[PDB]
RNA sequence: GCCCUGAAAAUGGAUGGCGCUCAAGCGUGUUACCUAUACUCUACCGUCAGGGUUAUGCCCUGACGAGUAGGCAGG
RNA sequence: GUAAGAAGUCCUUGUUUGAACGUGGACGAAUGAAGCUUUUAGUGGGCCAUUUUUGGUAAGCAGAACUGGCGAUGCGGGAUGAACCGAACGUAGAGUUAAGGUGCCGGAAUACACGCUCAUCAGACACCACAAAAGGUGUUAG
């Protein structure tokens, strides 16, 4: 659904011999805490030798954008174990929040590649502070000075079945 | 292995059958291997053992004689006796509880500190 | 659906009534239904259960069996009870002076008991004497 | 003969749980909490926001 | 004699009201203290973890046809005999293995006091030898489970949620809850995937309250 | 990733038909909605069980109801 | 395989340097809810599906081992269908749903949003299941 960003920490369970282990942290994009924790353990099993029974989560928290009205140019690293060995992708998204960037990214991947949530891995979403670090042309299109453009075909949603007007699509 | 002969076995004790290859005499019972039975009588040379063997869907009782070399003391009831004695002690202390067993319970609340262990963030 | 576990609509058996058509026997079970329901004594429920039994499962009980029961310790003056039928026995020569209650006595058995001195009684009279079955000794015949 | 449900029918609600009367008097669900100002730690907000 | 009856009733009623006030105090101070502990850890720069849940509520999601024998037997054992029937269970390792077995056919989670109260009030039915007797009065509980000191429906709710010495006896006295299908719907189009994959079954850990409040 | 080709005959013919092209198609997400002898509530019929009562009957309570070969019972 | 107790634990001295029997004193993991006969119908090498495994070759496949279902079984859906999805049945009413669906036939949004696609007979469940290995100055994103 409409995603959210979640901070998660894991402790892998203490023992004698080893009190206070090392508290690995992760950032997750997900609808809710259940999915976030499942993804946490899914990545932690890959990185280190831990298990949901062999470990525990310490502090689930939410991360809200510091400036969710400021428009931003995000660059996203992505990878997906297909079909060959894993291969990476860099994309650029003009949006207000990391959540919106990730949502439209998942939709764009599902559209343009038939690649799915299960298949996708998010490496790093990162705001680009300076212009001229924007590489892709479809984002470069929208940074020009005093940008204007029309909407030449207007088609009006009609509530009724019949109309007496011979309608017009102007602007 | 001479410690397999200085082994008293009184009527009542429970023992597993595990026959070793090193003694051709009295190699018993192809499938009586890793099976437990208590001892009913003892002679020289010898120990008795009874087993509940199932045929059809009833447990009949097969009594048998074995050489001491193959049999072995069972550690089946170690925690049982330990728990019984500890239960007697705990009952005495109560007279002065949940002495019963319980499965693994959900671990309770606690606090995790950050003194030198700052959480280490990472990714795939 | 329910995914049942107990084979619904069980009948429980247990012969709530007798197959017989003897009206007098039906009076007897009508009385013992009241007694077993209102007394709390177990003797009456036993007798009511026994009244439903068949001829195959109500074997006769002999004078000699009764005398054996009365040779027991501290059981000579008890009122012995056979729900079924009581037969004579010419193998025993000495018989006590006991009280005995039953549905049906034979002529020879009744004569022997009366001759020894005792009395032959019915179950309703046993009820008005000893409702809870106090100081009673129930007997049953060999089944096989 | 008929089951009447609490959470409606205050009479059968009050048949049970007579604490409900004073519960509704003190209102005990719109109850305010004692205010505090326990601010969090710099390390906490740091490790939340990043790194 | 009627005055004696009313006197006994009044005594038991005062006992019930003081007990219920005590339980309310217990619940509010417990949750407030947990909150303040979280805040204290945050202020000191440390982290606070809450105790793992000890009670769960389970709801059947799949019918009776083409169920394999092991989950069929486990559902019999947990008294989930039909679709949408439900029960509380105390979670240990022994029960977690069962839940692992019956995950595809049930939705379970960690319930709230509000939903426990609503269930026990609206759909609370009891067993008096048999028969699924509606509760309808605190006397029916004080008869059977007064052996364990549970004189009221709220005392029963307390022994349930605060899992007590006699949780087994109280829960077995409680007939399996008969629930309807949710009024808003199940959400997801297809039910028989995990809660994570856009399904409904498996553990969801807090939204079971929403679900059973729609279903009750 | 989508599209074309990537071979298949012979009565006239079928994404079920109409027809659909920023779709009424493909992928994905968010809601609302339709709907079964399924689930919940109520009544009624029958069976079963449990209780009560000077009457193979009367009363109270509750759970259940698929069915061929075939079996039992009441009519 | 065995064990998880009152047919079990702990004090009391007569019969081969001691064993067995006997005398009397003190006290237990989770969940859920009977046994014994007696007797006789019909069926007793039939059909489908999944996953374990041995042998396999043009392709298919043949043998065994569980499990589930049809046979005996109606209901909703898949346009239609013995073995596919859901769900198992007393007679009625109200509400909510499952699976499948909401342009018209046809009850229900010609709903919202992001992209892609133009096929000289597109597509409208796929399956590196077949045609199969590629070809193309058609298009989009890497």
Curated annotation (Swiss-Prot), chain A:
UniProt keyword annotations, A-Z: Cytoplasm, Isopeptide bond, Phosphoprotein, Ribonucleoprotein, Ribosomal protein, Ubl conjugation
Compartments reported by the entry: Cytoplasm
Cross-link type Glycyl lysine isopeptide (Lys-Gly) (interchain with G-Cter in ubiquitin), residue numbers: 124, 130, 148
GO BP annotations listed: cytoplasmic translation
Modification type Phosphoserine: residues: 31
GO cellular component assignments: cytosol; cytosolic large ribosomal subunit
GO molecular function, one term: structural constituent of ribosome
More details: Present with 54300 molecules/cell in log phase SD medium. There are 2 genes for eL20 in yeast.
Protein role: Component of the ribosome, a large ribonucleoprotein complex responsible for the synthesis of proteins in the cell. The small ribosomal subunit (SSU) binds messenger RNAs (mRNAs) and translates the encoded message by selecting cognate aminoacyl-transfer RNA (tRNA) molecules. The large subunit (LSU) contains the ribosomal catalytic site termed the peptidyl transferase center (PTC), which catalyzes the formation of peptide bonds, thereby polymerizing the amino acids delivered by tRNAs into a polypeptide chain.
UniProt xrefs under HAMAP family: Ribosomal_eL20 (MF_00273)
Family: Belongs to the eukaryotic ribosomal protein eL20 family.
Protein name as it appears in the record: Large ribosomal subunit protein eL20A
Lineage, top ranks: Eukaryota, Fungi, Dikarya, Ascomycota, Saccharomycotina
Gene name of the encoded protein: RPL20A
From Swiss-Prot, chain B:
GO molecular function, one term: structural constituent of ribosome
Crosslink (Glycyl lysine isopeptide (Lys-Gly) (interchain with G-Cter in ubiquitin)) position: 7
Domain of life of the organism encoding this protein: Eukaryota
GO BP terms, alphabetized: cytoplasmic translation
Gene Ontology cellular-component terms listed: cytosol; cytosolic large ribosomal subunit
Keywords: Cytoplasm, Isopeptide bond, Ribonucleoprotein, Ribosomal protein, Ubl conjugation
Intracellular or extracellular location(s): Cytoplasm
Family of the protein in this entry: Belongs to the eukaryotic ribosomal protein eL21 family.
Function as written in the Swiss-Prot or TrEMBL entry: Component of the ribosome, a large ribonucleoprotein complex responsible for the synthesis of proteins in the cell. The small ribosomal subunit (SSU) binds messenger RNAs (mRNAs) and translates the encoded message by selecting cognate aminoacyl-transfer RNA (tRNA) molecules. The large subunit (LSU) contains the ribosomal catalytic site termed the peptidyl transferase center (PTC), which catalyzes the formation of peptide bonds, thereby polymerizing the amino acids delivered by tRNAs into a polypeptide chain.
Subunit and interaction comment: Component of the large ribosomal subunit (LSU). Mature yeast ribosomes consist of a small (40S) and a large (60S) subunit. The 40S small subunit contains 1 molecule of ribosomal RNA (18S rRNA) and 33 different proteins (encoded by 57 genes). The large 60S subunit contains 3 rRNA molecules (25S, 5.8S and 5S rRNA) and 46 different proteins (encoded by 81 genes).
Additional facts recorded: There are 2 genes for eL21 in yeast.
Name of the protein in question: Large ribosomal subunit protein eL21A
Covered range of the whole protein: 26 to 153 of 160
Curated annotation (Swiss-Prot), chain C:
UniProt GO cellular component terms: cytosol; cytosolic large ribosomal subunit
Compartment(s) where it occurs, according to its Swiss-Prot or TrEMBL record: Cytoplasm
Bridged cysteine pairs (disulfide): none
Residues annotated with N6,N6,N6-trimethyllysine modification: 49
Keyword set includes Cell membrane: no
GO biological process, one term: cytoplasmic translation
UniProt KW keywords: Cytoplasm, Isopeptide bond, Methylation, Ribonucleoprotein, Ribosomal protein, Ubl conjugation
UniProt entry tagged with the keyword Cytoplasm: yes
UniProt function note: Component of the ribosome, a large ribonucleoprotein complex responsible for the synthesis of proteins in the cell. The small ribosomal subunit (SSU) binds messenger RNAs (mRNAs) and translates the encoded message by selecting cognate aminoacyl-transfer RNA (tRNA) molecules. The large subunit (LSU) contains the ribosomal catalytic site termed the peptidyl transferase center (PTC), which catalyzes the formation of peptide bonds, thereby polymerizing the amino acids delivered by tRNAs into a polypeptide chain.
The family this protein is said to belong to: Belongs to the eukaryotic ribosomal protein eL18 family.
Assembly description: Component of the large ribosomal subunit (LSU). Mature yeast ribosomes consist of a small (40S) and a large (60S) subunit. The 40S small subunit contains 1 molecule of ribosomal RNA (18S rRNA) and 33 different proteins (encoded by 57 genes). The large 60S subunit contains 3 rRNA molecules (25S, 5.8S and 5S rRNA) and 46 different proteins (encoded by 81 genes). eL18 interacts with NAP1.
Further comment: There are 2 genes for eL18 in yeast.
Name of the protein: Large ribosomal subunit protein eL18A
Entire-sequence positions represented here: 2 to 145 of 186
UniProtKB/Swiss-Prot annotation, chain D:
PTM characteristics: N-terminally acetylated by acetyltransferase NatA.
Subcellular location: Cytoplasm; Nucleus
Effect of residue 21 to E: Leads to an inefficient release from ACL4 with a delayed assembly into the 60S subunit
Consequence the record notes for mutating residue 8 to A: Significantly diminished nuclear localization
Sequence similarity: Belongs to the universal ribosomal protein uL4 family.
Job description of the protein: Component of the ribosome, a large ribonucleoprotein complex responsible for the synthesis of proteins in the cell. The small ribosomal subunit (SSU) binds messenger RNAs (mRNAs) and translates the encoded message by selecting cognate aminoacyl-transfer RNA (tRNA) molecules. The large subunit (LSU) contains the ribosomal catalytic site termed the peptidyl transferase center (PTC), which catalyzes the formation of peptide bonds, thereby polymerizing the amino acids delivered by tRNAs into a polypeptide chain.
Additional remarks: There are 2 genes for uL4 in yeast.
Domains as described in the record: The eukaryote-specific C-terminal extension harbors a nuclear import signal and delivers the ACL4-uL4/RPL4 complex to the pre-ribosome, triggering uL4 release from ACL4 and incorporation into the 60S ribosomal subunit.
Record's protein name: Large ribosomal subunit protein uL4A
